[PDB]
Every structure is written in C-alpha cells, then in structure tokens.
Amino acid sequence: GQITEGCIVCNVEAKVGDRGTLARASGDYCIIISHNTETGRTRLKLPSGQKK
Amino acid sequence: GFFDSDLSYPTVRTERMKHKRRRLVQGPNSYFMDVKCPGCKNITVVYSHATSEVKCNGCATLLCRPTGGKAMLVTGCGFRKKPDH
Amino acid sequence: AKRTVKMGVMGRYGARYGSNPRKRAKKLEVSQHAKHFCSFCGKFAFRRKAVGIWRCDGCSKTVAGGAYTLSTPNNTTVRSTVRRLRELK
Amino acid sequence: MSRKEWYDVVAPKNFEVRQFAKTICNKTQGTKIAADFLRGRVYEGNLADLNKNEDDAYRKVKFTVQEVQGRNLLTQFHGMDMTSDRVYYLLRKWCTTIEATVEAKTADGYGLRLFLIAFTKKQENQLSKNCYAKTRLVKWVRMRATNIIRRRLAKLDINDAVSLLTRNILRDRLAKRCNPIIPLRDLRIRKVKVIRTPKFDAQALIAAHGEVPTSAEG
Amino acid sequence: YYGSSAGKDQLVYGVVHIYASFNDTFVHVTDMSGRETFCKVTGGMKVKADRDESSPYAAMMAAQDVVARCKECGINALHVKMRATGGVGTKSPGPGAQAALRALARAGMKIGRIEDVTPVPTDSTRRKGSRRGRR
Amino acid sequence: TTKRRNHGRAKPPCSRGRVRPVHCFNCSRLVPKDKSVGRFVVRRMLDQASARDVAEASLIYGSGFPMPKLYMKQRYCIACAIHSRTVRARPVEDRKRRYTSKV
Amino acid sequence: EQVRDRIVRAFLIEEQRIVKRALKAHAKVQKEK
Amino acid sequence: DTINTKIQLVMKSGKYVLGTQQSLKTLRQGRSKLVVISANCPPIRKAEIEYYCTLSKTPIHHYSGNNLDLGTACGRHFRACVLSITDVGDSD
RNA sequence: GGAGGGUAGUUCGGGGGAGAACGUACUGGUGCGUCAGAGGUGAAAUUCUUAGACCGCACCAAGACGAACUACAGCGAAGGCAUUCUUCAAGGAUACCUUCCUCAAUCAAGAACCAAAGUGUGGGGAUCAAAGAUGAUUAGAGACCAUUGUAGUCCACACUGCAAACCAUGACACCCAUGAAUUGGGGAGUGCCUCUCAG
Ligand SMILES: [K+]
Ligand SMILES: [K+]
Ligand SMILES: [K+]
Ligand SMILES: [K+]
Ligand SMILES: [K+]
Ligand SMILES: [K+]
Ligand SMILES: [K+]
Ligand SMILES: [K+]
Ligand SMILES: [K+]
Ligand SMILES: [Mg+2]
C-alpha cells in the first residue's frame, strides 16, 4: 500500500506473512497497477501477463 | 538629378547608407564615451558596444548592460561622446 | 586479427556446432570474461564469479548483476523510475 | 411505456433557472431500487437557457446526479464545452493559434483540467501579411496564463469556481494580463473537465442547492 | 395517458439524433441524458429497394412516423443533433439529413438549438484503400 | 519537356526535402500536402426553402438568430479535383494566373 | 586496519548524533519564540 | 566547469598535494587553504576529512565528478580521491 | 569584403537525444435504454443479428498518430523534421577599434551517415494490409469493386547500401538591369501596458 503505482517490485507476498512467493526467478518482476483504499486491495501484473 | 556621379568621390547621400566594409575604405562603426554615474565624482571611458561587464571604479556598480548591438546604460548615468582622434 | 580472421574466442570449438550458434554465443562469452567499470572505486576491475555475481579486484566488493554483463538495460530504467518516484514525496 | 415515471432535474443555486429538464426511469421492481439507476446520470443544458445576446448561446454545461429528493434530482457541475462550429468560426489563416492545458485544484478537493485557445491579431495600422509570432512569446503567454488560473482557483470552493468560469470573470483577467506580451485576440476557455472529486459530503450538497423548488410530479 | 403531468401550453423537450450516412438514415429520440430511448426509426424500415434507404423520401417517412408516436407522450419540442459518418469516413452529410429535419418542422414539432456533433480525430489511424486509393 | 516551372507543387529547391502526405477527400489516395488542391468550404446546414420552415417552428431561430454552418477543409488529389470540376485544364499562357485569395 | 575503522566509526558517528540533536532542539525553541 | 578553471590555475601557479595521506598531513600542520573532495569518496573517509577541516577552519569544496575525473582535471593519469591546495597563487 | 577561435543578446528555428504527461479518433470490452433490422454496391452477394446486432449515454484497456492553424513559410550535409512541460550536448546568422597571422580550394585510396521494401534475435500487435480465402463483374478475370486475412506496418540491438536518393543541373571564387513581397539579426507617428517587462 505504500508503493506508488507503476513501480517495479519483486519477492511479492500473495498472503500476509507468506514471506515471498511471486516473481522470484532471474530477471523477473511485477508491476503495480492500482490501489483501492475502500477495500484495501492492490492490483498487480504478474510476469506471465495475468493480473492478481 | 543632372549630376554625374563618379566612383572615386562618392556623394554623401549614397555613402551614408553603405555597410561598413562595403565603403570605398572600410572603417569602424563604434566610439568611446565618458560616463558619469550619479555621484562618485569619477569619470569612466566606456565602449559603445561593450559586450563585457563594466563596473565603476569607485562605487563598484554596473554601468552598462550587454546587448546584441549597442550597449545600454543604466537609467541614472548620462554620457558624452569623445572625438575620433 | 593475426591468429584468427573472425572466429575469435570461439576458435577452441574447431569445426563443430554451426556458425550461427557460435556467433550468438561469442557475444555473451566476450562480455562475461571482460573487465567492467567499478563505480565504487573508479577502476576497471569487475569480474564474474558464477552467474550473476561480480567481484572487484580493487576494493573487494561483490555486486549482484546480470548473467553475462554487470548491468542490464532493464536495470538502468528501473533505477531512474524509482528515483523519480522517491523524489515525488 | 407503462413502466416509466417522470422526474425533474435541478441545477445548483448559482444559476437563474433551476429546473431545466425532465426525464423518465423505470419503476422500482424487486431488487432494482430505481435510485441506483439514477445516481450517476449526466445531463446537459445550454448556458444561455440556464442563465436567463452573448457568446453563451454556444456553451454547454454538464451536471451529474448526486441525490434523489422525492421527484427532484440534485446535481453538481461536471464539465463545460464550447460547441464545434463556434471554434471553427474563430480560426483564420495567416495567424498563430495558441493552445494551453492547465491542471488546477480548488479548496474542496476538486481536480480540474482547463483548455485555452487564443489567436494573434493584426493591428489596425499593419500592412504586412503575416501576424505570426515568435515562439518565445508564445511560451511566455502559456506560462503567465497557467499561473493566473492556478492561483485564482486554489482558494475557492466548487460553487464559486463555477461562477468564475460561467460569468467571464477569469476570461477578462487573462485577456488583460496577456495582451502586453503579444497583441492577441479572442481568448476563450474552450473546455473544462473534472478529473477528481471529493467523497460526497452530504452537508455540502445541501448548502450548494440552498432552497430547492418543489415539483408537481406523481 | 402515460407521459408527464404538465400544462398543454408547456413545452417538454427531448433530443433527436439524426445520423445521415450515404447508405441509411437514423432518427432517434431520447431525453436530455442519452439514456432512455423513446423512438428509433430508420430509412430501411420504410422501403424495399435496398438502394433507396438513403433517399430523401425514406428519411421523410421515418420522421413523420416518429412525430405521430411521440405526440401522445406529451413531447412537443426537440433539440437537434446531426452527424455524418465521422472518424475515418466521409465527414459530409448524406442526402437524408435535410429531409428528416424539414419533415419534423412541418409535422408540427418545435425546434431548438440545432448543432452538429460529427466525430473528428485530432490525429487518426490509417484509412481504407491503398496509397493509390479507390480505382 | 517541363510543363511547369514549380513542377506542380509549392516546394522550391533548397527549401525542403520531404512534405508529409495527406489522404484525398474523395478517393483516399495519399498525396503530398503542397501538391494537393485545397479548398475551405463554408456551407449551410439547410437550404433556403428548408430554413424558412424550420425557423418558423422554432423560438430560438424564429427572430433573427443565425443558423449554424458547416466548416471543413477539403484536400484533393489531382485526379479527383479535375473530375469534380474544382479545377480545369487551361491554355498555355493562362496557366500562370494565381488568385491569391478566395473571391 | 579493521580496529582503526571501528574506533573512527564509533567516535565520528556519535558526534553527528550530538550535533543534529542540538540543532533540532534549538530550531524548535527559536520557532516557538 | 568554473571550478575546473580555478583548479587549472592552481596547478599552474600554486602548491598542492594529492591523496589522503598527504592532505591530512597538511591539515595537521595548518598549511591548507582549500580541500576538494571527489564524489566517489567512501562515507567513512569523507567524514574523517570533514572533521579535520572543521577543526582547522578550512573551506571544503565538493567535486561533482569521481576520483577518475578529479585526477584528469589536475592533468594526472591516475585517480585522486582528495586534493589539498596549500597556495592559491593567483586563483581564489 | 580568404580560413580558424572569442565575447553578447541566456538571441533564432516542425534541428538532434532523453524523461513525464495531454488530445480526440479507430478497434475491443463493461453497465444501462430500445426493438428489427444493420453493413456494403453502379446494382447485389459473401458478412453481423430476438442467444438483442446497428443506434444512444457513461466508463475501462491497449497500440498507433498529432487534424483545422499549415504556407511558392522555418530548420538540417543529404535521407529527413509538426501536441505540451522538464532536461543534455550542439549549429547557423548578426554585432564588435577582441585574438591569431596563410593555417586555404578540390580530390584516386580510405571512412561515416543514408526513405521504403527486405534479413536476424527479443518485445508489441489497435489500424491498414503483399500471400491466401470467399462474393461479384466478365466470353474468360487468375485483376480493378466488396467482406476478410498472415508476413509486415510500431520499439530495442545487429545487418543491408539501393530510389524519378531529381533542381533529371558537381564543389570553390569574380562581374552582372529593375519592381513589389517574405524569414532572422542590427542601426536611425500609433495601439496595449501589475510581471520570462527600462517591455
Ligand atoms: K487493395
Ligand atoms: K504509389
Ligand atoms: K498543386
Ligand atoms: K562565431
Ligand atoms: K444490451
Ligand atoms: K512526436
Ligand atoms: K482487399
Ligand atoms: K543510382
Ligand atoms: K530564419
Ligand atoms: Mg511576421
């Protein structure tokens, strides 16, 4: 929630406390699309092209 | 209009319009002037065009401002042209 | 180009594996064994030691880089984006 | 159709004519409340019809429905435009067209985007054929106008900013302050977009509308 | 009786969208917001020749049908919005644009605030045909 | 044989190298912008007969308020300008009249 | 070499904390008056 | 750069020392007039130099380039982390 | 009245390289409304459509492109270059009682750049559209016309080195008649005028 939209990230947690499960292979990363403060959810673009 | 014009002794009208280096004998376009800033008792010699910066010797104030072409003096000061030689 | 006209470092492979696979691997082989500029100490002393690990002979620093080159073009873009977003706060 | 009911559309209190439209909607049946279908519509009116022989006949204002009060739909400013045939009438050859885009914010928390247009003018004494301008002066006109708009709108609520835009107060200030840079003619505010809104203060909507006229529907 | 509770002398306004292309004509009546369509009659609903769908006659017939049906719901006046094909397209109005507008006035409706709303790009995609055009 | 001194366009030598092409108004053929034939058209939305009927039924235009017009800038390829009679073939020594303004 | 690095690090970093603490306190007092 | 012109003037008609070991000796003796530090200097070494300058009342200039650039400005073919001017002969 | 360098107006311009945004439009989605056709042509038929097409309003995503203003206008060695703001290094003209003192002109060999199509490896893929597929027209039609459709068209990094790459006019220097215009710098009555303003 504290990272600005459009920022490149890695080692993303899919659940709070998972300690990192997404974008862990060489040269991989995710992109932050948008935030939703009403529901507290963040939308990302995965390395495979899917959105989560 | 009946006058016949020769090239060795051109008339004043046609010579006053020519570009320098296009006259019969080229020459400068500039001159020097004595500039007295308000007060300070001092007289300075300033070039007409003077692309550089100029400060009065006494008051350490700028006298002229650079410009493409002739320089412009600050509002207070008044100048006086000097003879060519 | 006294010993070899165009093979270069790939001359150890003899007449095997094909010309185009050899050309593609030659570009990455040269940069992987080259000496790269070190920003910490201002020397050309960065050398690879296993994929993605670069060590400087001068200041003895280790950096996480990219496979066959010290820095990848994607990394350069990312550093500029993050700097602008930090300055935006 | 037999399922339709009629409603009235009401503009805010800084407009001479309050009820400027009528509309229809389905009856509330089952889980469809018929107020969820009405709370996002955009209605357009002509400024010359809302506000009473000027340029106002070529201006359009959009309002977005925020609340349903009986048979009255209460609205708020949403945008403003200029109509295409009016813009083409001001264009001429042998002139420079100056355009600007401005982002500004009000005190309430609204985000606005404004589009300006202006043209150079020939002067009555002139005999040449060009009237074009140097790009240094064009850049200066754009920045001076940007600063004036941002500073004026930064200390106003939405209702006062709307009155500024629709009564040609800001337009005259810009034309007067930009004339010394370059002669200029026909400065206008071409379009206004609302790109951000605050979180629907219900007390704010009450004060914006003041006294609401009644309706004779149903 | 269905439409509105207002005096007979009062004017109730709707909006008519007239889309006059070179192959058909649309006459479409809505309210001041674009939702809630009232009537929609096209020139191809009134002919059988497949080539007179754009004719001035087919546009006149469609306009007269609209006025009759809307005269019961209490709609007396209309604002007018006219358009041509637009974006990458002819940009000039078709043959039935004038006929439809004139037919509305003669049939007894009231007019106000005519305006043209053709979509115009400020820079576009490539148009059909080659770089040699249609031959 | 050089038919024209400007070769049919408005690009002197030593001035430009390339001019961006536009699409013909009619056939959609790509033509350079200086070579094309351009006209600015202002046309009424209704003719005289129809304007009288519409003005009578309206309260806005019913008393001396102008009806809207249509403004377009049309650009033609050479073939479509000749076929539509925008321009015509002219006698030699008459090909030089210029008509700097629309009158 | 490593012992010298720790001694210099210990003294110099503590100095910066003392200096910046005084600046923050003085600025607050100056602002309030 | 204007600082490059001043630096070139010092090399022409002044005295200086290049390097950390010689610069610190001048600071202890109090003979240094100006100290120039490159942008490459490690944080712990830079902090030590700034402390010596504060005690000595010596002005500090922060160079924009790294030690490779600073050595080039002085006409050298090596790197210079820090430079100390003991004589501003003509420049300032 | 040969070349080079300097200082100044923080001069002049679709000149070049990087970021961040903006604008409608084409296509595709989403939510509401409506009900029988829509599209296309010289005329039609392949196509879409009560499983709700076309049309109306509001939004969303992605890729490309910057209309009118735009011209016998500007910049670049040529090829080329058009939204705004922030940046980086350049280039020409003008002004000068600045500096220097033949440092120059043109060229086999050699070097760098070079529209579109094309090639290789990664991205991207909205529009248009070689090949190909359907429908027409025709004696025939492999074509022109209609509906589509892959490579390409866009970006990065490597190649290729050809155009009616044209002013079909090689580069440097001198002389040479007139009248109206236009772009940039410099010298010597009128309109606007609380700061990129002695403008
Ligand atoms: K074709
Ligand atoms: K062609
Ligand atoms: K022409
Ligand atoms: K120069
Ligand atoms: K639907
Ligand atoms: K661009
Ligand atoms: K085709
Ligand atoms: K050739
Ligand atoms: K120029
Ligand atoms: Mg001009």
Ligand SMILES: [Mg+2]
């Ligand atoms: Mg072709």
Ligand SMILES: [Mg+2]
């Ligand atoms: Mg030129």
Ligand SMILES: [Mg+2]
């Ligand atoms: Mg060319």
Ligand SMILES: [Mg+2]
């Ligand atoms: Mg759509």
Ligand SMILES: [Mg+2]
């Ligand atoms: Mg534009």
Ligand SMILES: [Mg+2]
């Ligand atoms: Mg290509």
Ligand SMILES: [Mg+2]
């Ligand atoms: Mg390719």
Ligand SMILES: [Mg+2]
């Ligand atoms: Mg590919």
Ligand SMILES: [Mg+2]
């Ligand atoms: Mg197609």
Ligand code: NA
């Ligand atoms: Na040619």
Ligand code: NA
């Ligand atoms: Na040739």
